[PDB]
Ligand binder design. Structure first.
Ligand SMILES: [Zn+2]
Length: 257
């Protein structure tokens, strides 16, 4: 039932998911001048060399690339995290125009898109259990700005025509998520939530300071996706982003000076 439209979008979500008005909702505006540098934060450990991608799916709200998370093959550790978090999937949020599309904002600036790499804490054994825990998930967020192409994104771009409408999926093996990462792993971190229903308050957010650049042609391909199933009226999958939510007694910490 939920979506991103006038009648089912973010301002409606609290009726089905009352935690939408909770104390640790995401995304937020990152006020860079208010974030405190924390010299106790470790460098983030991103160990993606043995990642095994499986499939790409249009889920009606975004598209997602799924990984084999049955072993410790692609894991996030360190930074603000205690323990080991397995990569489950990545997906994106994007706009109808290049000046909107990100969920997090940086001093109110919106990027054209935002990549989310979703990981779950192995101490909970499975993602469904993990979303019921306050430290269940770690989502690595990466901003996309429009300029030069990101060569590592092209394999994703090129298969989107095969998953246009909701419910379509394809095999998507040997995709290397290292090709989506910026140079620097400098980050902001704070405790928050899933940014889509069920909006569970289970996420340690790790948002990288450095955006990746993608080309206009790459982002245009995202915007050709459809929210609708084949057979329903065509509605472009654009503006699939939740706006910034109240910070409410949280501190955002910076890994860098
Ligand atoms: Zn997301």
């Amino acid at each position: 039932h939920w979506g991103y439209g006038k009648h089912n979008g973010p301002e409606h979500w609290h009726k089905d998911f009352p935690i939408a008005k909770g104390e640790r909702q995401s995304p937020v505006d990152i006020d860079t001048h208010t974030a405190k540098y924390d010299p106790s934060l470790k460098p983030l450990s991103v160990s993606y060399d043995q990642a095994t991608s499986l499939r790409i799916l249009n889920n009606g709200h975004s598209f997602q690339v799924t990984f084999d998370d049955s072993q410790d093959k692609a894991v996030l550790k360190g930074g603000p995290l205690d323990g080991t978090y397995r990569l489950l999937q990545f997906h994106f949020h994007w706009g109808s125009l290049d000046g909107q599309g990100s969920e997090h904002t940086v001093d109110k600036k919106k990027y054209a898109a935002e990549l989310h790499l979703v990981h779950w804490n192995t101490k909970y054994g499975d993602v469904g259990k993990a979303v019921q825990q306050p430290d269940g998930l770690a989502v690595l967020g990466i901003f996309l700005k429009v300029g030069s192409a990101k060569p590592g994104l092209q394999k994703v771009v090129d298969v989107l025509d095969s998953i246009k409408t909701e419910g379509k999926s394809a095999d998507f093996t040997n995709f290397d998520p290292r090709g989506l990462l910026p140079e620097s792993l400098d980050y902001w971190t704070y405790p928050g939530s899933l940014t889509t229903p069920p909006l569970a308050e289970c996420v340690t957010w790790i948002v990288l300071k450095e955006p990746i650049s993608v080309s206009s042609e790459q982002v245009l391909k995202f915007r050709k996706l459809n929210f609708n199933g084949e057979g329903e009226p065509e509605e472009l999958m654009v503006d699939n982003w939740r706006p910034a939510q109240p910070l409410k007694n949280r501190q955002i910490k910076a890994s860098f000076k």
